[PDB]
Design a protein around this ligand. Structure first.
Ligand SMILES: CNC(=O)[C@H](Cc1ccncc1)NC(=O)[C@@H]1C[C@@H](C2CCCCC2)CN1C(=O)C[C@H](N)c1ccccc1OCCOCCO
Length: 183
């Protein structure tokens, strides 16, 4: 898509158990805790991180590689979302996301969450946002960009932020990073 965006991970929002590659295009769940200003932005309870980019308007496309991963979380969220404390990832909270959990279960963050039927387990996900349209949509790059799920009527007011999680590593076998694909 010509609507493509080059997204850089924002280390200030990064949960402190996370590791970003030096070019801030990779993120993996570590096995200890970096010591960094426990600031207002940092996701504190969950392995979560936003992009440096704020979308106030327009259409914006990007892709993420999920090859070899048993869980993950991807989408857009309001700048205003809460960073500290426990919370349900959901549109009801200002997150427009889909996830793999414990592998073998793809779901959209509606309230309550919605199980997806997928023909092809993705190694690559496309994320698209039409602001003025109130659209966020997820495509299965591996299955000829088939629509996974789509949130409509989102009616956005704030600035918006891309959002990721490499998931949790309960298994020891969800260590592979998420990767932002060059485009
Ligand atoms: C529908 N119920 C769920 O468990 C969903 C489902 C879900 C799972 C994975 N991916 C997206 C969705 N989780 C959440 O919404 C959040 C996010 C999640 C992360 C996991 C790793 C990747 C990133 C997402 C963990 N999660 C919680 O744990 C909530 C939490 N349980 C809590 C919600 C409210 C109020 C007190 C809450 O917990 C208080 C303490 O309970 C822990 C028990 O000791």
């Amino acid at each position: 898509h010509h609507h493509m965006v080059h997204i850089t991970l924002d280390p200030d929002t990064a949960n402190p158990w996370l590791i970003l590659s030096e070019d801030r295009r990779q993120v993996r769940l570590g096995d200890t805790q970096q010591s960094i200003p426990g600031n207002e932005e940092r996701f504190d309870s969950y392995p979560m991180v936003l992009g440096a980019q704020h979308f106030h308007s327009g259409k914006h496309y990007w892709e993420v590689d999920v090859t070899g991963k048993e869980a993950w979380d991807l989408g857009v969220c309001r700048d205003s979302v809460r960073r500290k404390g426990h919370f349900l990832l959901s549109s009801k909270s200002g997150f427009w996301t889909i996830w793999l959990w414990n592998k073998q279960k793809y779901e959209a963050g509606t309230y309550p969450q919605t199980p997806l039927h997928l023909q092809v387990p993705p190694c690559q996900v496309g994320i698209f946002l039409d602001y003025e349209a109130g659209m966020v949509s997820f495509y299965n790059i591996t299955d000829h960009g088939s629509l996974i799920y789509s949130f409509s009527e989102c009616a956005f007011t704030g600035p918006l932020r891309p959002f990721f999680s490499p998931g949790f590593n309960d298994g020891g076998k969800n260590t592979a990073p998420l990767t932002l694909c060059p485009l």
